[PDB]
Amino acid sequence: HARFQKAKEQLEIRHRNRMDRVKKEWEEAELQAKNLPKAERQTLIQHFQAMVKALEKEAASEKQQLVETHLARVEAMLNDRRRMALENYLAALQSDPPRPHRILQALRRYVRAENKDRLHTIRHYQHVLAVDPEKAAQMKSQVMTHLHVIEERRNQSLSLLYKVPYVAQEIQEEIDELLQE
How far apart CA 59 and CA 98 sit, in angstroms, is: 56
Tell me: does residue 79 bind its own copies (CB under 8 A).
yes
Helix, strand, coil abundance in the chain, percent, nearest 5? 90, 0, 10
CA dihedral 105, 107, 109, 114 (to 10 degrees): -170
CB of 50 to its own copies, least distance (A): 5
* Given 6, 14, 24, 47, the residue binding its own copies (CB under 8 A): 47
Dihedral sign, CA of 48, 54, 55, 56? positive
Q: Which is nearer to its own copies, 64 or 95 (CB)?
A: 64
Q: Which is nearer to its own copies, 152 or 177 (CB)?
A: 152
Total binding residues toward its own copies, as defined by CB under 8 A: 33
How far apart CA 113 and CA 87 sit, in angstroms, is: 13
Region of 8-16, 71-79, 155-163, 165-173 interacting with its own copies (CB under 8 A): 71-79
Site string for its own copies, 50-69 (x = CB under 8 A): xx-xxx-xx-xxx-xx--xx
In 3D, which of 43, 166, 60 has the Cα closest to residue 103? 166
How far apart CA 104 and CA 153 sit, in angstroms, is: 17
1-40 binders of its own copies (CB under 8 A): 29, 33, 36, 39-40
Q: Which residues bind its own copies (CB under 8 A)?
A: 29, 33, 36, 39-40, 43-44, 46-48, 50-51, 53-55, 57-58, 60-62, 64-65, 68-69, 71-72, 75-76, 79, 142, 145-146, 149
